[PDB]
Amino acid sequence: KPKGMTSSQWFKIQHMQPSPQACNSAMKNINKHTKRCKDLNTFLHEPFSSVAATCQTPKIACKNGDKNCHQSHGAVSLTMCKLTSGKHPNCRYKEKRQNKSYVVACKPPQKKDSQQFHLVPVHLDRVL
């Protein structure tokens, strides 16, 4: 993740998009912090409080075996942004808008986090 960023702010910047936006504009806020074009990225069309609430679901196993994953109560509007062409930072994307559930790994916020929910998302483990 970018150096100096809190885990949940990187999560916010990569997966929080309540107001849907075109992939090719939105992906620039991600790739300005990366060295190569991100190949696949999912934007969740929900505010941060409702993903924070997902962290209050029962603990489930993440893909990597951790036990801090949480599934959403239901499906939400979301956009997948798959890379198709370009050399970084001129990344070009094709979009796919679906309605699906998701799974997030959560932990307590850090001291610098502006929204102190008792558990915040820090990675998107799945799109079911």
Ligand SMILES: Nc1ncnc2c1ncn2[C@@H]1O[C@H](COP(=O)(O)O)[C@@H](O)[C@H]1O
């Ligand atoms: N099950 C999945 N299906 C599709 N994309 C996924 C899945 N799990 C993770 N990703 C992608 O991996 C990234 C996870 O971000 P992070 O949790 O910050 O490492 C997201 O940008 C998603 O696009």
